[PDB]
Amino acid sequence: MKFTEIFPVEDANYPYSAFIASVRKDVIKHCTDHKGIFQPVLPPEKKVPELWLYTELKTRTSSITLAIRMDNLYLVGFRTPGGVWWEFGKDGDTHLLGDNPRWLGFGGRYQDLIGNKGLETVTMGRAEMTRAVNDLAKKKKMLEPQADTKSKLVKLVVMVCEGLRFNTVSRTVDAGFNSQHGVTLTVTQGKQVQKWDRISKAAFEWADHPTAVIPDMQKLGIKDKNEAARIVALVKNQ
Secondary structure, three states: OEEOOOEEOOOOOOOHHHHHHHHHHHHHOOOEOOOOOOOOEOOOOOOOOOOEEEEEEEOOOOEEEEEEEHHHOEEEEEEOOOOOEEEOEOEOEOOOOOOOOEEOOEOOOHHHHHOOOOHHHOOEOHHHHHHHHHHHHOOOOOOOOOOOHHHHHHHHHHHHHHHHHEHHHHHHHHHOOOOOOOEOOOHHHHHHHOOHHHHHHHHHHHHHOOOOOOHHHHOOOOOOHHHHHHHEOOEOOO
């Protein structure tokens, strides 16, 4: 339960990297050091999460607050300027968020947000982030209209959640944060990103046996633990 510092989306003076590094510092405070693992391991998963990241993204006209569960770096919902909380999921599910939340009518996986499309299709950057925040901020309907809101959510998910998790994503995004053509991930990066938990299990495995050969990693273009250590910044507890 830490409130990350505010991110002035439109303000080109505040780089994306400084936001990522800041928010990682906050998360790492709740991480542990495992013998044999380069990266700081996140709090262990729970049915009901106890550690939360509340990251506010504010433009020049509006803002929203992201409700990220630390223990798997995973966007659960967001708060609008009007104080309305929207949560991934639907009627009949259990709310993880408090303060009378509303369901978006759809989940928050790369399944539910973009179907079978590749992460390379999601365009990101300062402009995208600005457009997403302003749009999500003017949300009053029950995932119900329709989801160009899914599209705005997947961009934030990758820029924020995946950026915090991978050094690959954070550097790619930052390097193209103020570009006119936006910035996107390579097909390979996207496959690695959708495999975070797997790369994470590999981390543990490479702690047990540094030499171990792991085809689930070879197939993603990750040769060994040294290579995985530079791609993933924070590992999921296993």
